[PDB]
UniProtKB/Swiss-Prot annotation:
Tissues and organs where the protein is expressed, per its UniProt entry: Expressed in brain and CNS. Also expressed in the small intestine and testis, but not in normal lymphoid cells.
Species classification: Eukaryota, Metazoa, Chordata, Craniata, Vertebrata
Source organism: Homo sapiens (Human)
Outcome recorded upon mutating F150V: In NBLST3; somatic mutation
Residues of the full protein shown: 1096 to 1399 of 1620
Boundaries of every Protein kinase domain copy: 21-297
UniProt protein name: ALK tyrosine kinase receptor
Length: 304
């Protein structure tokens, strides 16, 4: 695997001894495998073990799944940016295989937005600035990927994570499974039409299979909508095909409920039909920052 002018393999991954790893609790699962909270320590008893998330590989898997799992580790390990989850190391010499990741106690961004929606029992659980900070965090991650010529291909709330639920939380890109599949096979290899994230994809991506850094720009727009709608599914009344037809004919989503105009404007700029008309992430960040500077934007009430 090559990134930012460097090539690496399985051996550059820090293999941590299996006996040093303890599983604490289940956190979740994606399509394939599980994620657990864990602790690492080479010392009994260790007053302060390193807390981690542990992503597992099902033992019942193909040799292609194993290589997929390997590639996920390498990809994460090669990033170096505060808005991308860290890889602490791996435990590949024991079964089931582990990838050790930065623990993100806030969980995934979609789930967080749904669960932390303001509603009588939690009237001010979240404010406009919280949403702008999450957006800026992910935009920073995306800019880092852009400058390093890495196309994520699935910039969505389900793929982002939070360091904690409360104030001070930092949003980070966590799931690189899509890019991994393309890097290994050249196409979505275990997927198919029904599994494609078409609701996050620009016209040239789903029509021509053309992906650039302007692909991620489009997707980031949809993520902005997700953030400012407080976790609704994009194009909520529409199926994937209806979205395909809607988007290709120039259709775009309305603003989320209570969304400030400057924020909505950023979404529509990200959704320009021609990729060359879409902003790069440095511009997106600049425009997000400008939003945070506007008291009228940040003093806007979220809907209850």
């Amino acid at each position: 695997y090559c990134f930012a002018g460097k090539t690496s393999s399985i051996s550059d991954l820090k293999e941590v001894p299996r006996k040093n790893i303890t599983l604490i609790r289940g956190l979740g699962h994606g399509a394939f495998g599980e994620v657990y909270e864990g602790q690492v320590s080479g010392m009994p008893n260790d007053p302060s073990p390193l807390q981690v998330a542990v992503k597992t590989l099902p033992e019942v898997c193909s040799e292609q799944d194993e290589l997929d799992f390997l590639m996920e580790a390498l990809i994460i390990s090669k990033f170096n940016h505060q808005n991308i989850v860290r890889c602490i190391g791996v435990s590949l010499q024991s079964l089931p295989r582990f990838i050790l990741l930065e623990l993100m106690a806030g969980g995934d961004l979609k789930s967080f937005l749904r669960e932390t929606r303001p509603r009588p029992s939690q009237p001010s659980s979240l404010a406009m600035l919280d949403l702008l900070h999450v957006a800026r965090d992910i935009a920073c991650g995306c800019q880092y990927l852009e400058e390093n010529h890495f196309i994520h291909r699935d910039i969505a709330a389900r793929n982002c994570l939070l360091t904690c639920p409360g104030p001070g939380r930092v949003a980070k890109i966590g799931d690189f499974g899509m890019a991994r599949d393309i890097y290994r096979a050249g196409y979505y290899r275990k997927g198919g039409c029904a599994m494609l994230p078409v609701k996050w994809m620009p016209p040239e991506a789903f029509m021509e299979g053309i992906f650039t850094s302007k692909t991620d720009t489009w997707s980031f727009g949809v993520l902005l909508w997700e953030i400012f709608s407080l976790g609704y599914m994009p194009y909520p009344s529409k199926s994937n095909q209806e979205v395909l037809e809607f988007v290709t004919s120039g259709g775009r989503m309305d603003p989320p409920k209570n969304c400030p105009g400057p924020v909505y404007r950023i979404m529509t700029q990200c959704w320009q039909h021609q990729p060359e008309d879409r902003p790069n992430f440095a511009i997106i960040l600049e425009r997000i920052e400008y939003c945070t500077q506007d008291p009228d934007v940040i003093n806007t009430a979220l809907p209850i």
